[PDB]
Amino acid sequence: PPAVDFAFVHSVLLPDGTPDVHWRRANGGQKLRDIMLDSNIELYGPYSKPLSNCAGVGTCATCMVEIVNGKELLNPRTDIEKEKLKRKPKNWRLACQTNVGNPDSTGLVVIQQLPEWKAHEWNIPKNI
Amino acid sequence: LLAGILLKMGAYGLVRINMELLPHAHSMFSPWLLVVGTIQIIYAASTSPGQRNLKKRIAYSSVSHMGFIIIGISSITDPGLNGAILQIISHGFIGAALFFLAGTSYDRIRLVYLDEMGGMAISIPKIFTMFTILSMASLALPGMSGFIAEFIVFFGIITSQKYFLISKIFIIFVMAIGMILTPIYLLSMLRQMFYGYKLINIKNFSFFDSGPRELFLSISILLPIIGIGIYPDFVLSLASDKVESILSNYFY
Amino acid sequence: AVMVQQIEGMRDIITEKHVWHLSDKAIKNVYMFYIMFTCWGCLYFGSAKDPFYDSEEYRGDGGDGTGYWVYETVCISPFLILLGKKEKNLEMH
Amino acid sequence: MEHTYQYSWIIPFIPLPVPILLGVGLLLFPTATKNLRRMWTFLSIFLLSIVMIFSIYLSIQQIFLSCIHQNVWSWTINNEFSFEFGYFIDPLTSIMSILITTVGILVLIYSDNYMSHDQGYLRFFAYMGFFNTSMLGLVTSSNLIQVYFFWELVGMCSYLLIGFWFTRPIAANACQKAFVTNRVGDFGLLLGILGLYWITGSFEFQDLFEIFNNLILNNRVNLLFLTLCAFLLFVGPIAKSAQFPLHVWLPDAMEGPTPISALIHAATMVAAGIFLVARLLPLFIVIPSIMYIISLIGIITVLLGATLALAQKDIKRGLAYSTMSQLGYMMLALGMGSYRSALFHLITHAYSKALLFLGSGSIIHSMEAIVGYSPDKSQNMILMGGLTKHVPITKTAFLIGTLSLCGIPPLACFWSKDEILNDSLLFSPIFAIIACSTAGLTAFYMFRIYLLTFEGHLNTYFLNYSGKKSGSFYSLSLWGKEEEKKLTMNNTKRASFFCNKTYKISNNVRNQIFITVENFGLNTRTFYYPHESDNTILFPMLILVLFTLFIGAINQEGIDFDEFLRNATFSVSIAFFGIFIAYCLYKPFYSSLLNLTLLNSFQKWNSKRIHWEKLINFVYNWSYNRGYIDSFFKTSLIESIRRLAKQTTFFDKRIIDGITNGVGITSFFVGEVTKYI
Amino acid sequence: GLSQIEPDINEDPIGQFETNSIEMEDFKYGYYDGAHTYYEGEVQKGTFWGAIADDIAAVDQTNGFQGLISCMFLPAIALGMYFDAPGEYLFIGAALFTVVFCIIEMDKPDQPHNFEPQIYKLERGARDKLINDYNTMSIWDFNDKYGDVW
Ligand code: FES
C-alpha cells in the first residue's frame, strides 16, 4: 500500500544522550495533526490538554513541528503558517495546516516534534 | 503666540465688534455659526490624524479647539460666552506650551513626521511628561482649564434660550464626538512620538533632556491650567459681569 | 448652612453649603504672585545652563535657533561637497 | 456626627500630597527623589491608611445613624453655574471608600516589591496615589459635575497606569485604546448629565432623587428623551465597568503591571461603573425601559465574560474576562433593582478577584526565574503547570479566591450569588437560567485557571518536553568508559547503525546527511526552581484571604446598612458540575481523586475527538478572536475613523486648500500671460 | 543630524498611524522597559539634599550676589502678603530686581554658544569680545571667509 514514512524525532533526548525515532506508518496525506493524533505521538506538548490549543484550525501557534527532509511531498505554507509564525528557521510548520500530500504517496519526511523546548539545531545542509 | 494670543483676536473680535456692536444681526448669524463650529470641531479633529506631521497636528488641534469658542460666541448665553473667553485663555496656554514642546522635540530629535520618530520617551522623559500633561489639558481633562471650558460651553448650549431641543441634541452630540476624536489624535501623537523602542537608538545618541529653561516654560504655562481647572474663577470672575453687559443687548 | 431634607426613597440629607469665594482682591493677588513667579523664573532659569543649546550638537552643526537650519544645512552641505568636488576636478581629481 | 463630617473633605485629598510631591520631584529633581525610592512608598501607604481609618469611622457612623451628609461648598458663582464639589457620604459611598482604601493599601504594599526591580518605580506610585485620590473624589461626589470630573481623572490614571511601561508598544496600544474606550463612555456620561440639567436643572444628587420621583408625571418631558438620557448616562458605566459594547479595554489592559490589574478592576475603577448605577437607581427604577436595558447589557456580558475566559492561555487575561463577567453579574443585579445584592457581590468580588490578581502576580514573579521576562511565557498559563509543590501560600490564596468566585458555601462566598439567583430566578425566564449556566461556566474556567497553574507537573522543566533540563541533568552517560570517550553531533540515526536495509520503497539513503548536534551539560547547571515571593507580597494576599473568608458571613445588615436549601443545592450542583468538568480534564491522573476506571472510560468515550474537534475549535476561536468584537471595532470603528481622517485631510489639503492656493496660482498665471501677451 | 552623505531612503514606510517601535517578537522585556532592571546595590547615597543642591549646582550661571537676590526675591513677594500689604512697593522692587539682573546678565564671560552659527570654525578663543570694547572686527558680513587670526 502507499505508505509515507514518518520519523517523529522527539525533542527530549534519551538519558543515553541520543534522539529517539518512532517511525509512524500512517497512510496518506490529510493533515499532519490528524496523523500524529490518530497515530498517537506527542504533537502539542504542554498544550495537549483539551482547550489549550485551537484543535486544528490554525489560530494558535501550538502544533508547530520542525520538518527536515520535507521539500518533497508537502503543501506550501498556507499564509497562516507564514503569518502565525513569522521569525522562525523556516523548517517549522504547523501540523494541522500542513498536508503531506495525497493517498498515493511515498516518502521519508522526518519531523522533529516540539521544536520549542529542544537542545539540538539539526544542521540542515544549506539549500541551493 | 501665533496660537497662544494671535488666534484669539478674531475670537475676541467676534465678541467686541459682532456680539455687542451688531447684536440683532448676530442673532441671525449665530444659528449658522453654531453649525459651523460643531462641524469645525469634528473636521479639525479628523484632519489631525490625517497629518503625519507633528506641528500641523497641533495647528489643526487649534482649529478644533477654536470651535468651542465659535460655539460659545454663537451661544446667546452668559455660560456660552464665558466659556468662549475661558477657552480663549485656556487654549492660549495649552496651544502655546504644546507648540513650544513640539518645537523643542523637533530640535532634539530632528524628525517631524510621526511615521518616523518612534519611542523617544526614554531619551527625553521631561519633554514626554510635559507633553503628556498638556495633551491631557488639550483633551478637556478635569483638573485642567480645557475641561471647564469645554463643559461650560456645553452648559451654555443646553441652557440656551435661542435654540430648541431638536437642535440642542444634534449640537451636543456633534460637539461631544469631538471629545472622542480628540483622544484619538492626541494619544496617537503621544504613542507615535514617545511610546516605543527603537533598536538603532540605544545609547550612541543620548540626546539632551529638557533643560531648566524649557522645563520652566512648560511648567509656567501648566500651573495656570491646573489652577483654572481646580478654580475656574481666575478667568470667569474677570469677564462674567461684562458678559451680562453683552447679553443685556440680546434678550431685549 | 445645615438643612435636613426629606426624600421618599432612601434617607435624609444634612446638606451644609459653605458658599464661599476667593474674593476680588485675592484673585488679583494670586495673579500678582504668579506673574512675579514668572518674572523670577524667566530671569533665573533664563540664566541657567541650558545644556542642549550650548553644546556642539546644536551649536556645532548649525544651531542658529531656527527650524530651517537643519534643512538649509543638509541642502548646503551637498552644495559644499559639490563645490569642493569641482575644486578637486579643477586640479585633476 | 457633629464635627467629624466637617472634615469629610480630606478623604479625597490626603493621598494627593505624594503624587504632587512626585510629579514635581520626578519631573524636576529625578535623581534626588528616586534616591528616596522606598520612603514615598511608605508615605503613600500611611496616607491611604489614614483615609482607611477615616472611612471605617464614617462607615461606623453610617451604620449607627441613618442619615446622609452632603457637605457641599461653592466652586464658581458667576451665572447659572453655582457649582459645588461636595461629598455625598451615603452607605454606598462608605462601601466604596472602604473598598478603595483597603485594596489600595494592600496593592501598594504589593507594589513595594512587585515594582522594586522596576527602573521607573516612583512614577508608578504617583499614578497610583493620584488614582486613589481621583476615585475617592469620584465616590465622594455630590453632583454630576464632580462625578464627571473624577470619572475623566480615573480615565487619565487608567491611561497612565496601563501605558506605565511606555517602552513596549503593546502597552501603548493598550493605553490609547483604554482612554479612547473610556471617552466613548464619557461622551455618553456628558451628554447624559447635561440632559439631566435640561430635564431637571439640578447638578446635584439631593435634588435629583427628590425630583425624579414626580418628574415623569409631567407633560413637557418626553419619556423617549428620558430613556435616551438614561442610556447615555449608563454608557459611562458601560465603559468603566467593561460592559458588552465598550468591553474591549479590559482584556487589553493587562499590558501594564499586575497591581493595576488588581486595582483598575476587581477594585475601585470598575467598581465606579457599578457605583454610579447604584447611586442613580433612585432615578432609573422610575424610567421604564432603562432597567431592561441595563439587565440586557449585564446578561449579554456575563456570557461574553464567560465564553471568553474558557481558553485564554494567559492568566491575567483570563482573570480580566472573569472580572468582565462578574461586573456583568453586578449590572444584572442592578437591572433587577436589587440595590443591596449588587453591592455585596461587588464587595466579595473586589476582595476575591483582587486576591486572585495578587496571586497571579506572585505566580508570575515566581515564573520569571524559570522563563525569564516574557508575558508570552511568564504569564502563559499552560506552561505554568504545577506550582502547588513550590509556592504553597500563593496556592492557598489563589484557591480561596477562585473558590470564592465559584460560590463555595462554607469556606468561601456563595451567599452573594445565592441572593443574586434568589432575586433573579423569580423575575424573568431569560435572565435566570442563562445566568446559572454562566455561573457554571464561571466555576469551570476559574478552576481551569487554578488547575493549569498549580496542580500537576511543572510543564516547563518537564522531562518529557524540556530537552534542556534533560541535557543538564544527565551530566554523564549510562555506560561510563564504553561506546565513546564521552556524543555530540549525532547523525541521522534512521537505521540506528543496526545493519538495517529498506525494502522496495522510494529511497532509504540519499545526499541528506544532517548532523543533529546536541547541546552540552555541566554548564549553567543550576536552573533554580520557583521559590516563593517575598513577605510583603504574601501579607497583602493573607489579608485579602482574611477578608474573603470574613466577607463570606456578611439578623442581617443589608436592611440596617442600606426554596432556600433547594436553590442552594441547585446552584452548588451547577457550580460543582463546572468544577468537575474542569477536574476530569485538567487534574492529572496521578493526583486526581477520581477512580482510574472512570478516567480511562472518559477518554475511551472521547477518543475520536471529532465532535469535540468542533466544539473546542469554536471555543478557542472565540477566546482567541476575542468574540470577533475587537476585530470588528478595529476594522469598522477605528479603521473607519482612520479612513475618514485621510478623507478629511484630503478634502482639506487638496480641494479647500486647493482654492486658497489656486487664487495664487491663477494670479501668477494671469500675470505671466498678461506679461507675454 | 549631519548626514554628510545623502541618507538611504527607507523602502518600508512603516505606516501613517502605527508607531515606529520594534515588534514584540524582538522585544526583550524587563531590560528594555526597565521592568526588571534596577537591582538595588548599584544605587548611591545623597538623600534628597546631597542631590538637590547637586542639581542646582549642575545648572547655574548665578554668582554670589546675582543668585542670592534670586533666592531672596520670591520670599520677599511671598511676605508681601501675610506679613504686610505694601502695594506698589512690590512692583517697583520687582522691576528693580529685573533691571539689575539684566545689567548683571551683561556678563563678563561671553560663552561662545551665544554667538552666531557662522562663528564656529575653530580657534574662537582668540576672539575676545569679553574685554575688547568696540571690537571693530568685520567678520559678521558672512559672505567670505576672512582670516581673523591676528
Ligand atoms: S492546533 Fe492550533 S495551530 Fe495546529
From Swiss-Prot, chain A:
One of its GO terms (biological process) is P450-containing electron transport chain. Disruption phenotype: Malfunction of the NDH complex. It is found in: Plastid, Chloroplast thylakoid membrane. GO terms for molecular function: 2 iron, 2 sulfur cluster binding; metal ion binding. GO terms for cellular component: chloroplast thylakoid membrane; cytosol; NAD(P)H dehydrogenase complex (plastoquinone). Residues 10-114 form the 2Fe-2S ferredoxin-type domain. The keyword Heme does not apply. Keywords: 2Fe-2S, Chloroplast, Iron, Iron-sulfur, Membrane, Metal-binding, Plastid, Thylakoid, Transit peptide, Transport. [2Fe-2S] cluster binds at residues 54, 60, 63, 96. Disulfide bonds: none annotated. Its main location: plastid. NDH shuttles electrons from NAD(P)H:plastoquinone, via FMN and iron-sulfur (Fe-S) centers, to quinones in the photosynthetic chain and possibly in a chloroplast respiratory chain. The immediate electron acceptor for the enzyme in this species is believed to be plastoquinone. Couples the redox reaction to proton translocation, and thus conserves the redox energy in a proton gradient. Part of the chloroplast NDH complex, composed of a mixture of chloroplast and nucleus encoded subunits. Component of the NDH subcomplex B, at least composed of PnsB1, PnsB2, PnsB3, PnsB4 and PnsB5. This is Photosynthetic NDH subunit of subcomplex B 3, chloroplastic.
Curated annotation (Swiss-Prot), chain D:
Keywords: Chloroplast, Membrane, NAD, NADP, Plastid, Plastoquinone, Quinone, Thylakoid, Translocase, Transmembrane, Transmembrane helix, Transport. It comes from the Eukaryota. Its EC number is 7.1.1.-. The keyword Chloroplast applies. Pfam families: Proton_antipo_C, Proton_antipo_M, Proton_antipo_N. It is found in: Plastid, Chloroplast thylakoid membrane. It is a multi-pass membrane protein. Disulfide bonds: none annotated. The chain crosses the membrane at residues 9-29, 40-60, 89-109, 125-145, 147-167, 185-205, 221-241, 258-278, 280-300, 327-347, 354-374, 396-416, 425-445, 537-554, 570-590. NDH is composed of at least 16 different subunits, 5 of which are encoded in the nucleus. NDH shuttles electrons from NAD(P)H:plastoquinone, via FMN and iron-sulfur (Fe-S) centers, to quinones in the photosynthetic chain and possibly in a chloroplast respiratory chain. The immediate electron acceptor for the enzyme in this species is believed to be plastoquinone. Couples the redox reaction to proton translocation, and thus conserves the redox energy in a proton gradient. This is NAD(P)H-quinone oxidoreductase subunit 5, chloroplastic. The gene is ndhF.
UniProtKB/Swiss-Prot annotation, chain E:
The chain crosses the membrane at residues 65-85, 86-106. GO terms for biological process: response to oxidative stress. It is found in: Plastid, Chloroplast membrane. It is a multi-pass membrane protein. One of its GO terms (cellular component) is chloroplast membrane. It comes from the Eukaryota. Keywords: Chloroplast, Membrane, Plastid, Transit peptide, Transmembrane, Transmembrane helix, Transport. NDH shuttles electrons from NAD(P)H:plastoquinone, via FMN and iron-sulfur (Fe-S) centers, to quinones in the photosynthetic chain and possibly in a chloroplast respiratory chain. The immediate electron acceptor for the enzyme in this species is believed to be plastoquinone. Couples the redox reaction to proton translocation, and thus conserves the redox energy in a proton gradient. Part of the chloroplast NDH complex, composed of a mixture of chloroplast and nucleus encoded subunits. Component of the NDH subcomplex B, at least composed of PnsB1, PnsB2, PnsB3, PnsB4 and PnsB5. This is Photosynthetic NDH subunit of subcomplex B 5, chloroplastic. It comes from Arabidopsis thaliana (Mouse-ear cress). The lineage of its organism: Eukaryota, Viridiplantae, Streptophyta, Embryophyta, Tracheophyta. The chain holds residues 51 to 200 of 212 of the full protein.
